[PDB]
Amino acid sequence: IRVEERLKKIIKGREKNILKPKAASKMVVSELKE
Amino acid sequence: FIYEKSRSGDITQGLPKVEQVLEVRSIDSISINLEKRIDSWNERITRIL
């Protein structure tokens, strides 16, 4: 969340690491749960 | 003196009840139960799928 807070206000350094490393919804439809 | 009677079968109970449910001004037909379901769905749509 804090990464989003600083990314909104243009760019101010902070090249620490790849904190997000996530995929986009995987196009998966699991029936039951989880 | 105060006595409780015991009618309260329901407010309108004929043409006016049918008019009330058919004319959906506010969704309150069985919204003591239906509105709960509808709001639950509308808030729970965002899920894994």
From Swiss-Prot, chain B:
It is found in: Plastid, Chloroplast. It comes from the Eukaryota. Belongs to the RNA polymerase beta' chain family. RpoC2 subfamily. DNA-dependent RNA polymerase catalyzes the transcription of DNA into RNA using the four ribonucleoside triphosphates as substrates. In plastids the minimal PEP RNA polymerase catalytic core is composed of four subunits: alpha, beta, beta', and beta''. When a (nuclear-encoded) sigma factor is associated with the core the holoenzyme is formed, which can initiate transcription. This is DNA-directed RNA polymerase subunit beta''. The gene is rpoC2.
